[PDB]
Amino acid sequence: MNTPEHMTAVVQRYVAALNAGDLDGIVALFADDATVEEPVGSEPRSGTAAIREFYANSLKLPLAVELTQEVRAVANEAAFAFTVSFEYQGRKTVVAPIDHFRFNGAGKVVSMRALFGEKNIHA
Amino acid sequence: MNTPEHMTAVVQRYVAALNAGDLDGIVALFADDATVEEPVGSEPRSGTAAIREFYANSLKLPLAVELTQEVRAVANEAAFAFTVSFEYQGRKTVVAPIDHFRFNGAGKVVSMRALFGEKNIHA
């Protein structure tokens, strides 16, 4: 089974890559068969190609990202609270999602779902 | 299809009833075929009786539960960060999970999963 230590590291690495703008770094964290659903309720993006393009499009504005609380991790799953902030054509927007990773036996993210609505989008 | 406002009030209500030791108020939030998985990794408790017994056992000690951040709600899901604190036999404990609800069309919780590891239990 996955250690919480590793899962927590991977979450820090995810946030590190977003702050650094490191697309290879982000996609590395995922398994090539993996899925991303951001926000929850949207068409989950599937495969390396789709996940790669999702984060490339996200990283068209430079992002300020930070964990706002300890990572939760157990039984092949982590979840975490954080902010994602960006500024464009006037104003700054702070989104506050809760994300959720499921990890495979190899310790790569096989699914990530980002849960947040309009009410969690502050601008 | 559920509204974010209804899912959000239900999260707040959940916290309030835990604080008020209100077994009935808590169980009334769930549908009859609902599941609770607390912690994540453990065997899901299925149905009103099993869910009721879980909360009956939990409320054997006085709890101080509060939301430490804003609720996330979208589609028919919600997630939240919170703490549960209890003190017993010479020790104060603070457990800091992230919870996730799925809601059915009638506005009741059909599943909860509480995600925390040993690392999120401060005692």
Curated annotation (Swiss-Prot), chains A, B:
Keyword list (alphabetical) reads: Isomerase, Lipid metabolism, Steroid metabolism
Q: Where does substrate bind?
A: 99
Q: What CDD domains does the record point to?
A: ketosteroid_isomerase (cd00781)
Alphabetized InterPro entries for the sequence: Ketosteroid_isomerase (IPR039256), NTF2-like_dom_sf (IPR032710), SnoaL-like (IPR037401), Steroid_delta5-4_isomerase (IPR011944)
What EC designation does it have?
5.3.3.1
Question: What induces its synthesis?
Answer: By steroids.
UniProt cross-references to NCBIfam families, sorted A to Z: SgcJ/EcaC family oxidoreductase
| Subunit-structure text | Homodimer.
Report what the protein is called: Steroid Delta-isomerase
Species assigned in the record:
Comamonas testosteroni (Pseudomonas testosteroni)
Q: Which gene encodes it?
A: ksi
